[PDB]
Amino acid sequence: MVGLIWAQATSGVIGRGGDIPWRLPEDQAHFREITMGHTIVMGRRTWDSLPAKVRPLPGRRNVVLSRQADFMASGAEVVGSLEEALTSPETWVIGGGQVYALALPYATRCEVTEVDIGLPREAGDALAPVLDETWRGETGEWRFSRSGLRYRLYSYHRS
Numbered sequence: 478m479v480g481l482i483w484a485q486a487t488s489g490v491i492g493r494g495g496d497i498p499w500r501l502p503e504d505q506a507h508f509r510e511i512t513m514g515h516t517i518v519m520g521r522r523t524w525d526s527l528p529a530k531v532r533p534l535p536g537r538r539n540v541v542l543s544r545q546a547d548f549m550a551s552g553a554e555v556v557g558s559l560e561e562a563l564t565s566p567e568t569w570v571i572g573g574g575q576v577y578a579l580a581l582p583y584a585t586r587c588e589v590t591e592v593d594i595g596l597p598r599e600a601g602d603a604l605a606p607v608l609d610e611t612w613r614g615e616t617g618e619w620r621f622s623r624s625g626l627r628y629r630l631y632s633y634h635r636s
């Protein structure tokens with residue numbers, strides 16, 4: 478099983494300038510729970526976004542996808558193809574926008590956090606993948622985060 482996991486604004490934005498224009502501390506803990514013990518696939522730009530003490534994220538097999546044959550990720554494995562990284566009974570692609578789409582053929586789970594932030598779409602932003610009509614969503618209750626933004630959890634599922 479390959480899953481995708483991301484947070485997004487009501488508009489689809491997941492990242493700008495190589496980072497995230499929000500931080501919900503509740504979102505970060507559902508990320509760790511959902512991924513703890515499994516494999517995480519990220520692109521080099523997203524690994525590049527993790528600070529040097531936080532990487533590799535703990536308790537997990539950190540796989541970085543990259544076209545540089547000689548790029549290094551201390552504590553992580555660097556694979557040149559997405560499907561090379563798919564070796565565990567549970568794989569979680571943790572972004573960003575380029576890998577969400579590339580991993581989207583392989584995925585049966587989409588855990589999406591929708592952040593009610595008015596963030597207009599802008600050039601160079603990374604986007605959540607467009608989920609086609611084969612995906613079936615469960616919708617949670619609207620919640621309040623301590624960062625002041627409200628959020629909600631979508632659980633898309635498909636055979």
Ligand SMILES: NC(=O)c1ccc[n+]([C@@H]2O[C@H](COP(=O)([O-])OP(=O)(O)OC[C@H]3O[C@@H](n4cnc5c(N)ncnc54)[C@H](OP(=O)(O)O)[C@@H]3O)[C@@H](O)[C@H]2O)c1
Nearest residue numbers: 483484492495496520521522523543544572573574575576
């Ligand atoms: N939940 C969230 O809101 C969330 C989650 C994660 C990340 N983010 C945001 O996502 C944004 C970054 O996403 P991104 O779309 O800019 O870059 P990315 O998807 O993070 O990684 C892009 C890199 O992956 C490699 N790559 C791309 N296509 C490939 C392919 N077909 N085969 C092999 N390797 C390939 C290349 O590395 P080389 O150039 O080294 O080849 C490319 O530069 C950041 O802003 C981050 O904050 C947000």
Ligand SMILES: O=C(O)c1cnn(-c2ccc(F)cc2)c1OCCCc1c[nH]c2ccccc12
Nearest residue numbers: 497504505508509523527528531534535571572
């Ligand atoms: O998982 C961990 O063990 C962990 C602990 N601290 N941090 C961390 C949080 C913020 C930050 F700026 C640096 C490190 C972690 O990374 C996970 C954070 C959840 C997250 C939201 N969007 C993401 C995009 C890519 C990758 C992880 C995320």
Ligand SMILES: [Co+2]
Nearest residue numbers: 510511512513
């Ligand atoms: Co688990």
